[PDB]
């Protein structure tokens, strides 16, 4: 668990995708909660933070270089047996309660030129998102506005300084993809994120109200199928559950059909469900005991 330098090691979060070795059944990501419910559900479930522990004969190398795109060489390395817990366990579009970037807003991808790969954004200034039982999440418009301005600025830096950066709503065949879908404990929020992703930046005139209110549907997990990976839901007729997180980053995919050579279009969400996991796993690499 200790850390020392003077030994360089090569990393590549792409070739060594380590969520690719975290494929255990859904019924083991949840344990039955014994929380004295003393209105109540018969059985309740709690999520266990997502993490990876190195099996015997193997160790996990952790790159401690703060600003690190995930690939290339790494000087400051350390040895651990487990990666750091990821919470929340699902998060489709926004990334909450993650680690903030040092001084700079950082974006990364396995291949920026390949629109198939997810773009993972890491902010340096957290944006609060307060959600309630009444079925809505709130985000300060001024703070989100500045966030997009900083993100669009980095995206330009990656795709060319004279590119107009356009944010559009998700496109997909399920609410888990289309909405910002995340869990705060055993309560799952499906939030309409159209309002967060409906702007264009730096076209010809770019150099609403007080708060952005996202409508959200809330479901409570009450069971699941183990060999199928299917969750089972019920309305939270339990009452009003509150949840406040920090937006610390986000997932984007870039459009491949865009006929405008002067713009790039980005939509919220990744190309894979476990992309939220990947946003937190770029500094690790599994190796054999030396």
């Amino acid at each position, epitope marked *: 668990e200790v850390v020392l330098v003077n030994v360089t090691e090569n990393f590549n979060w792409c070739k060594n995708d380590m969520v690719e070795q975290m494929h255990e059944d859904i019924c083991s990501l949840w344990d039955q909660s014994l929380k004295p419910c003393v209105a109540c559900p018969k059985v309740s479930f709690e999520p266990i933070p997502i993490h990876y522990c190195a099996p015997a004969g193997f160790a996990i190398l952790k790159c401690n270089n703060k600003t690190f795109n995930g690939t290339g060489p790494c000087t400051n390395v350390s040895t651990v047996q487990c990666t750091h817990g990821i919470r929340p366990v699902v998060s489709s579009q926004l990334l909450l309660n993650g680690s903030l970037a040092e001084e700079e807003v950082v974006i990364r991808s396995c291949n920026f030129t390949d629109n198939a790969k997810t773009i993972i954004v890491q902010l340096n200034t957290s944006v609060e998102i307060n959600c309630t039982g009444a079925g809505h999440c709130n985000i300060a418009r001024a703070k989100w506005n500045n966030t997009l301005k900083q993100i669009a600025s980095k995206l330009r830096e990656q795709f060319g300084n004279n590119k107009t950066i356009i944010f559009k709503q998700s496109s997909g065949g399920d609410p888990e993809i289309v909405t910002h879908w995340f869990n705060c404990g055993g309560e799952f929020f499906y939030c*309409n994120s159209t309002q967060l992703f409906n702007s264009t930046w730096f076209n010809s005139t770019w150099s609403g109200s007080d708060t952005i209110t996202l409508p959200c549907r809330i479901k409570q997990i009450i069971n699941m199928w183990c060999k199928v990976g299917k969750m089972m839901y019920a309305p939270p007729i339990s009452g009003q559950i509150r949840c406040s997180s920090n937006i610390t980053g986000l997932l984007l995919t870039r459009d*491949g*059909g865009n006929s405008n050579n002067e713009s790039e279009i980005f939509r919220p969400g990744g*190309g*894979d469900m476990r992309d939220n996991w990947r946003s937190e796993l770029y500094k690790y690499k599994v190796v054999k005991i030396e």
Partner: antibody
Amino acid sequence: QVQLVQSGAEVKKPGASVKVSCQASGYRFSNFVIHWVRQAPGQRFEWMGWINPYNGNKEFSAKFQDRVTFTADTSANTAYMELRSLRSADTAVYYCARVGPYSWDDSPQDNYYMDVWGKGTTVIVSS
Amino acid sequence: EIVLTQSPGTLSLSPGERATFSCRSSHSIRSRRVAWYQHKPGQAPRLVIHGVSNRASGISDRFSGSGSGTDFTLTITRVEPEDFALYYCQVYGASSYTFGQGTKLERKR
């Protein structure tokens, strides 16, 4: 334009297996469920199952669950259907089809109709 | 399990005439998840109607779907030569996927 391109016609012996591919273009492949449906000579269309490229989740028709495997390669924008223990009655045109777009106002699976179809691939099972 | 039965088996009409396709379900379709497909020989089937009454993209406004519960209808105000084809109804979603046996829209002479 949204398009599904399927692999060429196939001739198989009974007891063998066949793998049919379905390649997408014009949209984000991983973001839409894909259905597999067949129609044998003189028969109705039969739904075999679906796969979700985004999470690997699948669903099977009880008629085919034991003999069929759905798979996806997002890096290749391709979904695959493999049917094993083939029999002469499995002789059919096999179609992939994408679900329609989901919207906030929909209930889950309101969009699970067959929005865009491939042209199909003929599978012949015969000795 | 849900059985869909279409009528008539064959619809013989001239261009300009109204067409009415019937789909009858053994089960009341509360979800309103009924679709209609057009299929021409050697061509990919095409979505015409979804959600009982929603015209699919690119579909002529001569097409419309209606009905409820057990009885569903596809109608074409005035048939055009390109409408000649097979038409299938189907139920979809919630593990219930099933198709009618089809109705042939052929040209009268």
